[PDB]
Amino acid sequence: SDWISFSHMSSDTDHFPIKSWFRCEQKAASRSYATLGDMSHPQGIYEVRAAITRLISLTRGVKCRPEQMIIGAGTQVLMQLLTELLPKEAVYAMEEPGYRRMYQLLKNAGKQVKTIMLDEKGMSIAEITRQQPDVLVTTPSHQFPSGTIMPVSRRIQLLNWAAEEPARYIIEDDYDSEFTYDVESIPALQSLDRFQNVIYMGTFSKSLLPGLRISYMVLPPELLRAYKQRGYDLQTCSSLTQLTLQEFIESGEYQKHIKKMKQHYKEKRERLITALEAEFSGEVTVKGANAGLHFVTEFDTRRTEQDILSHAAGLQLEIFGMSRFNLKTGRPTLIIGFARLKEEDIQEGVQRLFKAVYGH
Amino acid sequence: SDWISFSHMSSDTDHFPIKSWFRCEQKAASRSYATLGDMSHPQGIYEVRAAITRLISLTRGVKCRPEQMIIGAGTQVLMQLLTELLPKEAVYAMEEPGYRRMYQLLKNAGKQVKTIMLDEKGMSIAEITRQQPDVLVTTPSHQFPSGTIMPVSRRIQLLNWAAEEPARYIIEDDYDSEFTYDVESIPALQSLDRFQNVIYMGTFSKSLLPGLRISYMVLPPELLRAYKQRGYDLQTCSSLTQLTLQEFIESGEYQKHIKKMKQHYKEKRERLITALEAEFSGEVTVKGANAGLHFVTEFDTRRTEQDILSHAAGLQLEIFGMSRFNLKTGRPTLIIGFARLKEEDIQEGVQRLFKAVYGH
Numbered sequence: 164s165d166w167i168s169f170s171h172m173s174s175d176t177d178h179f180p181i182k183s184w185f186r187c188e189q190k191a192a193s194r195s196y197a198t199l200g201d202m203s204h205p206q207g208i209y210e211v212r213a214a215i216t217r218l219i220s221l222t223r224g225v226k227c228r229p230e231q232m233i234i235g236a237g238t239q240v241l242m243q244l245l246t247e248l249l250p251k252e253a254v255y256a257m258e259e260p261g262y263r264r265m266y267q268l269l270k271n272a273g274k275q276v277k278t279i280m281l282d283e284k285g286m287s288i289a290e291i292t293r294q295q296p297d298v299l300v301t302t303p304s305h306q307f308p309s310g311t312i313m314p315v316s317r318r319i320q321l322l323n324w325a326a327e328e329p330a331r332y333i334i335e336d337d338y339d340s341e342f343t344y345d346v347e348s349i350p351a352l353q354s355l356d357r358f359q360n361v362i363y364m365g366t367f368s369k370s371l372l373p374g375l376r377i378s379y380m381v382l383p384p385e386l387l388r389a390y391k392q393r394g395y396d397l398q399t400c401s402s403l404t405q406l407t408l409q410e411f412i413e414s415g416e417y418q419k420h421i422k423k424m425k426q427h428y429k430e431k432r433e434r435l436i437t438a439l440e441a442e443f444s445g446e447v448t449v450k451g452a453n454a455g456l457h458f459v460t461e462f463d464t465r466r467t468e469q470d471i472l473s474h475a476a477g478l479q480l481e482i483f484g485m486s487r488f489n490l491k492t493g494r495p496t497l498i499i500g501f502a503r504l505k506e507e508d509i510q511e512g513v514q515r516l517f518k519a520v521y522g523h
Numbered sequence: 524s525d526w527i528s529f530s531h532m533s534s535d536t537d538h539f540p541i542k543s544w545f546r547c548e549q550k551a552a553s554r555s556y557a558t559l560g561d562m563s564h565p566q567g568i569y570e571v572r573a574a575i576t577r578l579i580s581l582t583r584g585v586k587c588r589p590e591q592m593i594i595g596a597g598t599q600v601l602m603q604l605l606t607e608l609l610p611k612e613a614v615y616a617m618e619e620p621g622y623r624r625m626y627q628l629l630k631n632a633g634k635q636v637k638t639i640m641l642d643e644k645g646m647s648i649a650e651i652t653r654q655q656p657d658v659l660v661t662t663p664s665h666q667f668p669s670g671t672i673m674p675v676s677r678r679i680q681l682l683n684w685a686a687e688e689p690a691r692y693i694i695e696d697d698y699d700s701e702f703t704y705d706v707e708s709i710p711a712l713q714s715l716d717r718f719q720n721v722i723y724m725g726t727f728s729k730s731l732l733p734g735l736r737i738s739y740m741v742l743p744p745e746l747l748r749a750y751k752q753r754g755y756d757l758q759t760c761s762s763l764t765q766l767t768l769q770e771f772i773e774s775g776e777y778q779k780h781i782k783k784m785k786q787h788y789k790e791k792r793e794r795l796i797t798a799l800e801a802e803f804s805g806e807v808t809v810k811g812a813n814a815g816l817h818f819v820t821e822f823d824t825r826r827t828e829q830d831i832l833s834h835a836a837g838l839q840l841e842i843f844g845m846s847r848f849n850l851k852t853g854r855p856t857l858i859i860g861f862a863r864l865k866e867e868d869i870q871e872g873v874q875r876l877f878k879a880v881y882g883h
């Protein structure tokens with residue numbers, strides 16, 4: 164099987180410093196072996212939380228203390244916990260299109276979920292004003308899946324909405340925030356907030372490996388107060404993985420890895436986009452390519468979205484359609500992930516994509 | 524700080540084959556490295572599930588197929604999932620005393636939880652008959668915390684109750700089931716069932732390390748059918764830890780480890796009990812010492828339970844009281860864990876316990 168992946172759900176393994184990660188694991192183990200016989204602190208190991216706290220403060224401008232952070236064996240399990248801290252009758256609002264898994268979670272939890280359309284600045288403040296939700300779920304760095312980078316002006320507008328009335332919350336899902344392309348980084352919503360109505364959520368799945376299972380979220384003082392009154396929660400993220408992450412960060416291996424990958428991802432994205440317009444002779448529209456590890460491609464073709472997806476499968480091309488992210492009409496659109504995609508598979512994979520779309 | 528631990532929440536690190544575990548990790552990694560770039564199958568990696576399936580079939584007699592198993596980053600997260608598969612208005616029944624964390628979870632989930640007292644055969648079938656619950660939560664191998672081993676006759680009685688009426692479930696929490704002392708092993712409730720009304724739950728926290736975070740549960744066909752209709756769940760247990768566990772088991776390292784520890788735990792328990800009656804001159808009543816990694820000690824003393832716990836702290840002795848496990852009166856009773864307890868700390872720790880109980 165000679166498969167080529169344009170999947171957004173896969174990550175890079177070719178350039179991941181797996182030997183350094185293991186060497187960090189050995190060092191952390193031989194240093195904190197005796198602690199492995201006990202269960203971790205429910206919020207996660209303090210030193211690990213402190214290591215992440217410093218990191219996100221530098222890279223995203225996030226203001227927090229380690230006592231506010233909770234780890235974190237996946238965004239969903241943390242989101243599950245978060246819904247139980249927020250008001251039970253809270254009305255949730257998600258981006259349309261958006262993360263369907265998180266949508267289905269909220270629906271299955273008996274919560275009312277409203278869908279918010281997007282403009283060129285991302286999540287529409289006009290629609291939020293109209294539908295009047297309680298909790299916002301947004302992806303500022305790189306809108307999942309449209310890829311729109313929410314500008315500061317829109318970020319300020321959401322912050323104002325949350326601040327002008329009591330019991331309003333913003334869940335900043337800062338997924339896929341490590342990378343931008345020929346545009347500058349923008350501070351997180353949580354950092355621009357003059358108050359404390361933002362829950363910041365992050366993950367290491369795209370910067371490290373998705374199989375590692377480490378996420379985190381930062382609670383506002385009152386929500387943190389509600390969490391501590393539980394007293395029955397147990398840490399879900401592995402202790403070995405926590406201590407390995409701490410060493411990986413503090414040894415400087417993480418920053419060294421990120422520095423290497425921004426250049427790698429920049430070059431690969433450039434080649435892929437160049438190859439796309441070359442093969443399609445400019446008959447492909449690329450959207451949301453200024454950040455993240457995926458972008459969107461629309462096609463002027465007589466074929467439907469599943470006809471394309473079907474042919475791609477027969478051509479051994481792993482790809483997903485944009486209708487996957489509909490929560491609640493025009494040219495067919497696909498999502499193109501280039502994290503796992505090997506550089507040598509670019510020209511071949513783009514040729515296979517052409518056949519899946521046009522036929523020949 | 525020269526602390527001695529009688530804690531039931533700690534595990535053995537002195538005799539854990541940590542170097543073998545890492546060597547298993549290296550072998551599994553170099554063999555399945557490419558899979559680390561993708562998220563695991565939501566139920567867990569199939570080969571890992573199959574490895575656990577064969578294991579529990581041999582040791583506990585559990586009848587199941589890998590398709591029925593779900594991993595599994597902790598019993599609580601699996602129990603959380605289980606409450607969402609079972610009927611929403613299901614009335615739960617737990618052992619009194621029992622696992623307070625699991626009790627608080629169910630209460631926080633808006634579920635009605637009834638408490639069932641114990642007799643010499645464990646969870647009272649007479650009280651279950653009287654209170655008429657929907658779902659039973661029990662710990663047959665070693666009752667948490669009383670330590671009573673549920674005999675087959677009582678196991679059969681619970682199975683009959685669940686089978687004589689529709690929509691009745693038994694959650695077999697087979698925690699602390701690896702070890703018995705001078706008594707024979709008893710097949711799991713799930714294995715003795717002539718039908719399929721039992722959910723079998725297990726963990727590797729006591730056989731391996733609690734920081735590893737690997738648990739599992741086996742669903743009945745209909746409950747499995749309800750799980751698959753979700754389609755939004757993500758695996759919470761680390762992929763590296765899964766693949767390491769598989770290698771650890773299949774290489775024969777696990778069986779070799781268990782064989783070594785049963786002899787270790789047997790000798791240590793014997794010495795501890797011998798030391799207890801020697802120091803206390805026979806004025807200590809030991810209960811529930813035929814299995815598990817802890818037993819119960821009652822004391823004829825004028826001191827209350829927290830006076831004892833307080834003095835133990837000042838004497839640098841980590842210990843917990845039995846009132847910790849009350850869900851909803853006589854001689855003070857403490858729980859004595861001997862998993863982490865070093866052999867050289869037995870005589871000293873038992874002397875410290877005497878001072879905490881009697882004063883001198």
Ligand SMILES: Cc1ncc(COP(=O)(O)O)c(CN[C@H](CF)CCC(=O)O)c1O
Nearest residue numbers: 171172237238239262307336338366368378
């Ligand atoms: C909106 C969003 N926030 C966070 C994550 C990270 O979750 P975690 O690693 O468990 O912390 C994802 C990633 N979701 C998966 C990407 F591979 C699945 C995509 C699909 O269902 O199309 C995501 O979309």
Ligand SMILES: Cc1ncc(COP(=O)(O)O)c(CN[C@H](CF)CCC(=O)O)c1O
Nearest residue numbers: 531532597598599622667696698726728738
């Ligand atoms: C009844 C019961 N079933 C399972 C587990 C194992 O859970 P997990 O490792 O996450 O799979 C425990 C262990 N509970 C902890 C033991 F250290 C805490 C004890 C306390 O709260 O007293 C337990 O009591």
